[model samples]
Target: SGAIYVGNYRVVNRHLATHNDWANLVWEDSSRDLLVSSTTAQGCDTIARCDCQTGVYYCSSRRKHYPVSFSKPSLIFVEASEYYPARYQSHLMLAVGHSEPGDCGGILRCQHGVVGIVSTGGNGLVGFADVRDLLWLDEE
Candidate 1:
């Protein structure tokens, strides 16, 4: 059977609309966390939090700017290998995403499963909320 692989950062929201904000999204390794940097997009930042333990996720924005604010999302990179395990006939793949805070927000999924979400966006920048650790493979 063939294996399914998902790229790092599943969903990307580019804020190209007028009256939209500009932000940069960056990823971190130490805490496996995402950070967002906001510039002109003030009072319009939001964060999407993912609870791996419960498999539940949602979006939350600043109380000041409730309806007009929208954040941007982006895909970082994917980890892939050509070598296959003895027990498996396909290669191994891993996807990663980041979310900072008060900025960008999104989620990465493999095989239709939620992998992560964008956590923050602000100051013309966006970040990620890694949920890759919560990924699980499905059997056929």
Candidate 2:
């Protein structure tokens, strides 16, 4: 017999496609102990835990700041299965565009015109039609 431990942590979820002019989504989880702990000072709490009896797993918000601009909009797509992995494994596409620069950061205007600040950059209007994508290659 041992003690169950739970802790809070963060997670980064990458989008397979672009949505809402954004590329990826980051999420953070703030919850109680949902797992068994062997040591109090162990770093295992950061990982996720699930209940096999009830068939339920705890998950937190995948929120992050996205960069955007009015004149230049970005597109982001996320697999629905990724967001709601319990039910289905589908894809969710989001097109994020910018309306106007806000105080906190740039506004993420969705298809329906929902405004939210994802991220802000120091450089002001560097150039128009600027596009770049990041990729990683395995060592050969």
Candidate 3:
């Protein structure tokens, strides 16, 4: 088990279809307590309203990260949730595949940018919350 923080943060009003399968996070510094900066859709059950926050540690995705390309299959990296030895794996995306168990909360990333966050996996398929669809508090 690892340190987990449970706090209430208001969800801002954004005009997008909502679902119960995935979510994007508003906080960083997850490494401090192993928060890992990811959330499951079903886990977000409420909302609040407030402006975004930034600081010296702030780092937004604005460089040269490209949006996820759905045109072709690509390999991306995922962190394993286990701390037993700490590891990560690469998987071919937009295709049926298998990821390690307990991969939830891990980041889904490619060479360009983050594609999503691991949610769950079973039967050779892993689910992730699409970061592109999420409401971003920062300007990108």
The lDDT leader among the candidates is: 3
| lDDT string, candidate 3, 19-134, tens digits | 42125444432221111233442232211122211101101222222233231223344344433123222222332335344444444454433444444344655544333333
Query: What RMSD, rounded to one decimal, does every model reach?
Result: 17.1, 18.9, 14.8
What lDDT score belongs to each candidate, Candidate 1 first?
A: 0.29, 0.21, 0.31
Candidate with more favorable, higher lDDT: 2 or 3? 3
The C-alpha local distance difference test score for the whole of candidate 3 amounts to: 0.31
The positional error of residue 98 in candidate 1, measured at the CA in angstroms, is 15
- Winner on TM-score (1 vs 2): 1
Count of backbone collisions in candidate 3: 4
Off by over 4 Å in 1: 1-30, 34-58, 62-111, 133-140
- Give the alpha carbon lDDT tens digit for every residue of 1-140 in model 2: 11112122111122211252132222211111011112223223211121111111111122333343343223322122322322211111122332121222222333322222222222332111111110110000
Error of 2 at 66 (Å): 17
RMSD of 3: 14.8
C-alpha TM-scores of all predictions = 0.23, 0.17, 0.32
Per-residue accuracy of model 1 over 1-140 as CA lDDT, tens digit each? 00112332212223211122123332223233322222332232222233322232233442221211122223333222222122221111222222224333333333335444443333433233343443321111
Off by over 4 Å in 3: 1-94
Model 1 lDDT, full chain set: 0.29
Runs of candidate 2 exceeding 4 Å displacement:
1-26, 29-102, 126-140
